[PDB]
Design a protein around this nucleic acid. Sequence first.
RNA 1: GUGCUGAAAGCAUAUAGGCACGAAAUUUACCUUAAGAUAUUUCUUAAAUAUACGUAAGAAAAUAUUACGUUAAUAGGCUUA
RNA 2: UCUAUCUUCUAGAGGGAAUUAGAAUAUAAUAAGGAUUAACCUUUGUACGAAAGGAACAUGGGGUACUAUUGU
RNA 3: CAGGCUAAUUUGCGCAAGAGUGUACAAAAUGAGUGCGCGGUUUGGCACCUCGGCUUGACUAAUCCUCAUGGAUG
Lengths: 46, 119, 194, 307
Amino acid sequence: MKVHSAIKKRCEHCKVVRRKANKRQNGYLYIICPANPRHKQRQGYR
Amino acid sequence: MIQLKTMLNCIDNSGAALVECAMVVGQKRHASIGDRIVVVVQKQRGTKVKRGDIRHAVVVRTKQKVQRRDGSVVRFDDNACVLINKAGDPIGSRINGVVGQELRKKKWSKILSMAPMQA
Amino acid sequence: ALPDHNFFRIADKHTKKTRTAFAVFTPPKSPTTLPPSSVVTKSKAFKIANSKLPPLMTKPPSDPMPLLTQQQIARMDPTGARTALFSKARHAARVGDVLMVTHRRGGEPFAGVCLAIRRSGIDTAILLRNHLGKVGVEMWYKIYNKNVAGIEIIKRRAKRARRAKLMYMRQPKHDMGSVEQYVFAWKKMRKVLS
Amino acid sequence: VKYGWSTLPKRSRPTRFNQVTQGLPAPTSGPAAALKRREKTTPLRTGVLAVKKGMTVFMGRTGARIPCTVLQLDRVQVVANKTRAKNGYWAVQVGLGERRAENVGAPQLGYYEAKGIPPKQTLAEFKVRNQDGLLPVGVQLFPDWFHVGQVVDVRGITRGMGFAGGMKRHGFAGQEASHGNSLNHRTIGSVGGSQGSGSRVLPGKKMPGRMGAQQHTVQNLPILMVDNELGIVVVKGAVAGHKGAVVKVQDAVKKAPPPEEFVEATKQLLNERFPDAEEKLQAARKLHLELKEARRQGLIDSLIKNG
RNA sequence: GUGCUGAAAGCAUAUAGGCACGAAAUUUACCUUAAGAUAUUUCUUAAAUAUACGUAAGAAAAUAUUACGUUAAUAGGCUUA
RNA sequence: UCUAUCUUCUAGAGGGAAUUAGAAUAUAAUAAGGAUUAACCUUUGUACGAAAGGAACAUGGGGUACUAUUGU
RNA sequence: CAGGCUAAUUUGCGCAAGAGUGUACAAAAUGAGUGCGCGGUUUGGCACCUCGGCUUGACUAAUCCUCAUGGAUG
Ligand SMILES: [K+]
Ligand SMILES: [Mg+2]
Ligand SMILES: [Mg+2]
Ligand SMILES: [Mg+2]
Ligand SMILES: [Mg+2]
Ligand SMILES: [Mg+2]
Ligand SMILES: [Mg+2]
Ligand SMILES: [Mg+2]
Ligand SMILES: [Mg+2]
Ligand SMILES: [Mg+2]
Ligand SMILES: [Mg+2]
Ligand SMILES: [Mg+2]
Ligand SMILES: [Mg+2]
Ligand SMILES: [Mg+2]
Ligand SMILES: [Mg+2]
Ligand SMILES: [Mg+2]
Ligand SMILES: [Mg+2]
Ligand SMILES: [Zn+2]
């Protein structure tokens, strides 16, 4: 995982999602990829 | 109870006769029979260790009273040790003098096998 | 059903009249020692310590320490031979004598001259000094501990020492040195005798 | 707020109107919740009051030498029982010793009168887990209440030390002794930071003061000997307080309870040694009403001279 | 950080919705102190009770705290071990 | 150099107002603090690896007392 | 000297972009000269205002160890 303020897709298999959002926190924007795990990124800090 | 600057009589055929404790290894409390220390050789006897060498040693008998589970208490008239290497085995091959029987429960078999008498 | 009791009275001293009274209950005057119990358990993990139950509601001995000391001594020394070896009698071992302590689960009895006898009940101990080679070695031994398999007198002092403790023998002037001489002579006299 | 988060006045009693049977959530605070979060650590049985008599060693038949403390039981009785319905928690009130009636007050004289028990010297509550830990009132507890090897916790009052400095009370190192130090060999030194830290001494600052004479608990002490004749329970290790002081002995909370066969064997011995505990209790309660009514009317003197 | 189900968006997705795993931090538990509701088939009609005084102490700068005061082992003495 | 007046602080007290006439004894909810380390062996020379080397998970290491367990 | 304002500078940091290094392959690691910022530790500006050690703390988290964990042709 790489934490950036500017998360970008690096291939056609990367997807933008917002996870860990619940009734207590807003969550983070993620770049998830089933092809290359080196594309995994998170926007925002805990 | 051995601590920094304490002098000990080395009783093995390593070449050292009088060593000074520089560090208690593995604990903060003062070292007793069966504890490792780092010593500096101050006197020799006439690959032997020379004056000024820095080696590890094991306290084999102390002047402070050492109590045991059976209520027995042992006391010697001097503080002695035997030099060892960082591996943990002795440097010399023969020990002249009595050693403390507390070396058994601290995994010092090699030091005891070469010890003639135990107290 | 109603246990025995007595009445305690509180009187008013300004009128010499009974303010209030209460029935104070007393323990059974005649202490009742109930019969043996029928509760029996079958387990390897515990036992019930109901060996000797005293009478109900009776004050136990005030100081059970001396009584507990004689139970342990009688248990650690059934024959009473060790208690007599260090008693304050003429035949007993005195300070200044030479004693050999045999060790249970051990070899090479430690022999030395006795410098002190600390009488502390079950923790009574003797200090023996010797010279194993060129190094002096003092030893405390709890006489009632089971690791002390045996204690023998191998050499008595000619004249009774003028001191309860002989810590001056640490000085080279009065240091007896090694004891292998008296140990050897003692063993020699032993085998030649039987 | 005075205490915690609750602004509720201290004279209001709304508890019985907030019930779970009405569909409301179970509160995380309160007696019911407090007990639930202590069910695993609350002992099943009660304890005993014992007197510290001295320290010694336990000599084993093969070479063991174990330091130990001797605790004597002096006429330990069950005096009362606490229930959730009446008190909000389960507990057994145990007594110790005796006391002269003149020294006991009228309120306590009538408290023992209604129970058929002689006035005791000290009382103490021992918390149990559920209704199975309550015992008949008026039964004597002996050292056999415990078995050899049973681990227990011992609570007592520590030896008092009076006003203690910072070295003894908090372990402060002190200052130098010879290298120019002036009148500050055992002093506490600086007591805080300057303006940037509040311009005040912060609460909780460790300072000289009284030391000792406080309750202290030693946990996980095995029992080495159990003698009913002497009435002693020898436990390993040290115990808080001086000789002759009362201590509280109970099963350890950080350990599993004793086997079920043992808990039932002990309760079965109470019934054998005191089969009339209930018949003698109800008789004492009946007499209390008769004497209580006589005191009210003022005819107590008659009931005393008749016998 | 890691998942199951699963659409908005025919796919995909541990994104919404419905479930779950997971840390020397947190909370509880454990220990002490404080708090003082409450309990007793408790006491009290001028008392219950407390204090003072005296002998003390598991207490101790004062204060306080915990006992005892002849129907008594509180302190001292004496006696024995 | 300074015998601490005040605030804050550490301890201990005198008085008090409590569902309320006042007490003795034992006390709950609750609150404020306290305790707070790391390593080794066993597992196992197992997974991994050509070899050297070498984990993770889990159990135990309170007993020359009880108990538990391993040897004889 | 300290406090206050400021932040050029700093032995304090972050983000963006990506020449280049990485046998291959930008982003495992690495990151020229730069841009946009945070912070108030260093050296300075202004002029509102005329040391170190010992003892004993409290607090921060931008983490040396211990705990959980993603990435790692490498
Ligand atoms: K009443
Ligand atoms: Mg005292
Ligand atoms: Mg000092
Ligand atoms: Mg001076
Ligand atoms: Mg302020
Ligand atoms: Mg994640
Ligand atoms: Mg789908
Ligand atoms: Mg899916
Ligand atoms: Mg507690
Ligand atoms: Mg005083
Ligand atoms: Mg007397
Ligand atoms: Mg003042
Ligand atoms: Mg101030
Ligand atoms: Mg509470
Ligand atoms: Mg065994
Ligand atoms: Mg100016
Ligand atoms: Mg990985
Ligand atoms: Zn991708």
